[PDB]
Design a protein around this ligand. Structure first.
Ligand SMILES: *[C@H](CS(=O)(=O)c1ccccc1)[C@H](CCc1ccccc1)NC(=O)[C@H](CC(C)C)NC(=O)N1CCNCC1
Length: 215
C-alpha cells in the first residue's frame, strides 16, 4: 500500500455532517463507509441517510447507541438504504419508514478488521476505501482538539464509545496519523476532521472495532 492516502482528494467522501443532540455516531460512521463503496462502485457520490439507520435498525438503540455491523446487516437484509433526500435526518428516533422508492444503495455483507491490528487497518483503507472505526473519544482533549496529530496517554483502547470514519492515513512532520471524519459538524476540530496517531500502539483503540461493507 502507498505511504499516504486521502479519499477526500479522490471524491469518496461526502461533506461533514452533524448528528446534533442524538448520539447516532454509529449511523454516520455506517453511511460514510457505504458512501465510499457506492462511489467506488458507481462513480457517483451521494449522501446516504443516517436516519434510515437510526429508525430501522432494531438491533441498535437509536440515539442511545449502536454498532456499525448491525447497520450493514440491516442494509443487506433490507436490500437497500435511502438517500438523505428520501429519508431526511431529524435527530430523534421515529418509527421505521423506509421508502423503497428513494433507495440509493445496497449492501451485500461486511468484513471486520483483525482486532487491534493497525497494519491490517492500513491495508484495508488502501484497498477498499473509507473504513468505519470505533474509538475512545471521552477525553476533554478530544473534544477540544485543534491542530496536529491527536495523541493522549489517557486514551483507553478498551473504552470505545464513539464511531467515526477513517478516510486515509499519512505522516505529518514525522508523525504518522489516521485521517478521521467526525460527525459533530464542520465547526469542530479541523473543519470536522481530526488526525489521530497511527502506530502508537493502537491509540484510543482505533483498530479494535473496524469494519467495512461489501457491495
Ligand atoms: C456516539 C458517540 S457520541 O458522538 O454521542 C459521543 C459524545 C461525546 C463523547 C463521546 C461520544 C454513540 C453515543 C451513544 C450514547 C448516547 C448517550 C449516552 C450514552 C451513549 N456511541 C455509540 O453508538 C457506540 C458506538 C461504538 C461502536 C462504541 N455504541 C454504543 O454506545 N452502544 C451503547 C448501547 N448499546 C449498543 C452500543
Amino acid at each position: 500500500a502507498p505511504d499516504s492516502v486521502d479519499y477526500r482528494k479522490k471524491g469518496y467522501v461526502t461533506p461533514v455532517k452533524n448528528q446534533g443532540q442524538c448520539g447516532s455516531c454509529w449511523a454516520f460512521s455506517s453511511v460514510g463507509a457505504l458512501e465510499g463503496q457506492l462511489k467506488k462502485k458507481t462513480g457517483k457520490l451521494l449522501n446516504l441517510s443516517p436516519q434510515n439507520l437510526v429508525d430501522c435498525v432494531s438491533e441498535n438503540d437509536g440515539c442511545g447507541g449502536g454498532y456499525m455491523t448491525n447497520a450493514f446487516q440491516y442494509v443487506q437484509k433490507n436490500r437497500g438504504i435511502d438517500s438523505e433526500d428520501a429519508y431526511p435526518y431529524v435527530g430523534q428516533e421515529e418509527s421505521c419508514m423506509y421508502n423503497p422508492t428513494g433507495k440509493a444503495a445496497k449492501c451485500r455483507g461486511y468484513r471486520e478488521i483483525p482486532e487491534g491490528n493497525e497494519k491490517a487497518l492500513k491495508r484495508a483503507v488502501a484497498r477498499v476505501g473509507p473504513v468505519s472505526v470505533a474509538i475512545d473519544a471521552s477525553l476533554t482533549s478530544f473534544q477540544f482538539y485543534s491542530k496536529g496529530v491527536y495523541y493522549d496517554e489517557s486514551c483507553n483502547s478498551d473504552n470505545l464509545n464513539h464511531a467515526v470514519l477513517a478516510v486515509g492515513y499519512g505522516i505529518q512532520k514525522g508523525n504518522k496519523h489516521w485521517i478521521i471524519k467526525n460527525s459533530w459538524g464542520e465547526n469542530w476540530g479541523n473543519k470536522g476532521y481530526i488526525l489521530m496517531a497511527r502506530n502508537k500502539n493502537n491509540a484510543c483503540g482505533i483498530a479494535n472495532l473496524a469494519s467495512f461493507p461489501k457491495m
